[PDB]
């Protein structure tokens, strides 16, 4: 059936979100801001209420990188 109607769908998206955050922050920790933010914006994109996530990010990211993030939001 359509996405979301299967028990396994919620597990896949939680795993996807964790992966994307871990990958993004690893890439950021290497200096690859652009690809890191790509992954962070994928994580945000599957999150139904990303208010605190965005807040922490804007708190913690360099401001030109946060700007990049918004461009890719």
């Amino acid at each position: 059936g359509p996405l979301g109607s299967d028990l396994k769908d919620a597990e896949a998206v939680q795993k996807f979100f964790l992966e994307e955050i871990q990958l993004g922050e690893e890439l950021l920790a290497q200096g690859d801001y652009e690809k890191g933010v790509d992954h962070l914006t994928n994580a945000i994109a599957v999150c139904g209420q990303p208010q605190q996530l965005l807040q922490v990010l804007q708190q913690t990211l360099p401001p030109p990188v946060f700007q990049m993030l918004l461009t890719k939001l």
Binding site: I21, Q22, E25, E26, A29, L40, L53, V56, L57, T60
Partner: peptide
């Protein structure tokens, strides 16, 4: 560092 990811997870 890559465990920064735990902070982002805690935001939910």
């Amino acid at each position: 560092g890559p465990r920064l990811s735990r902070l982002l997870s805690s935001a939910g």
